[PDB]
């Protein structure tokens, strides 16, 4: 259900993720670090399962942020992949991949991997 | 097939991995970077499935290397997880995780991930 996913979410290191879920399966929004302020804000695009299995199953979703806005360009892109579990405490549990542009010789050490949990605070 | 893992293997970048596979699942040997000078060598240890399935499946394996020896200490460790495939053209197909010892503040950026394909050529 797109409604449960729509809102303001936060991760354990203080970053902010604002998102809207469209009825055709689209995800659109912005991602920002705890420094806050205008720019630390970057555009995000993703997809989710608009018709989830019933059960007590989670809803699968994923999104990308490329780290370039009008103030900085870090020359890297991050993708998060996980699932939305609703209830009193709704959470999005994920694993992420961060790739940096490198020359051919340093290509072998271009990607970092890690994991993030988001608690919701507003629609 | 099983014991086919013992030997000398090379990844796509010239690094050499020399391994011995024990009848009950142990993996032991050394790893050395390309250039090949005699301490670029570091110690490795691991485990593999010593009784694999009889349908056409590969043999599951894994191993670790901490990046310290008598000359250098790079305060890191790498693990490779994957499967051996035998035949006229034998290979070991893997993925790996490289973690560095960091402070609490840098803990989120401590691990890299990549993939490697080892052949006897």
């Amino acid at each position: 259900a797109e409604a449960g996913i729509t809102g303001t979410w936060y991760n354990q290191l203080g970053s902010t993720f604002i998102v809207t879920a469209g009825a055709d399966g689209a995800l659109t929004g912005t991602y920002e670090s705890a420094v806050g302020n205008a720019e630390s804000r970057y555009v995000l695009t993703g997809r989710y399962d608009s018709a989830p299995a019933t059960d007590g199953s989670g809803t699968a979703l994923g999104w990308t942020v490329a780290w370039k806005n009008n103030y900085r360009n870090a020359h890297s892109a991050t993708t998060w992949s996980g699932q939305y579990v609703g209830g009193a405490e709704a959470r999005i549990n994920t694993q992420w991949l961060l790739t940096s542009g490198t020359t051919e010789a340093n290509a072998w050490k271009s990607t970092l991997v890690g994991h993030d949990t988001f608690t919701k605070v507003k629609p | 097939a099983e014991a086919g893992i013992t030997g000398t293997w090379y990844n796509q970048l010239g690094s050499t991995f020399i391994v011995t596979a024990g009848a009950d699942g142990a993996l032991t040997g050394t790893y050395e970077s390309a250039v090949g000078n005699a301490e670029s060598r570091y110690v490795l240890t691991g485990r593999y499935d010593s009784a694999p399935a009889t349908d056409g499946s590969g043999t599951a394996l894994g191993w670790t290397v901490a990046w310290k020896n008598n000359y250098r200490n790079a305060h890191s460790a790498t693990t490779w997880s994957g499967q051996y495939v035998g035949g006229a053209e034998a290979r070991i197909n893997t993925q790996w995780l490289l973690t560095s010892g960091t402070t609490e503040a840098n803990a989120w950026k401590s691990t890299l991930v990549g993939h490697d394909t080892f052949t006897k050529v």
Partner: peptide
């Protein structure tokens, strides 16, 4: 440093 996390 990177902007993903502080």
């Amino acid at each position: 440093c990177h902007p993903q996390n502080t």
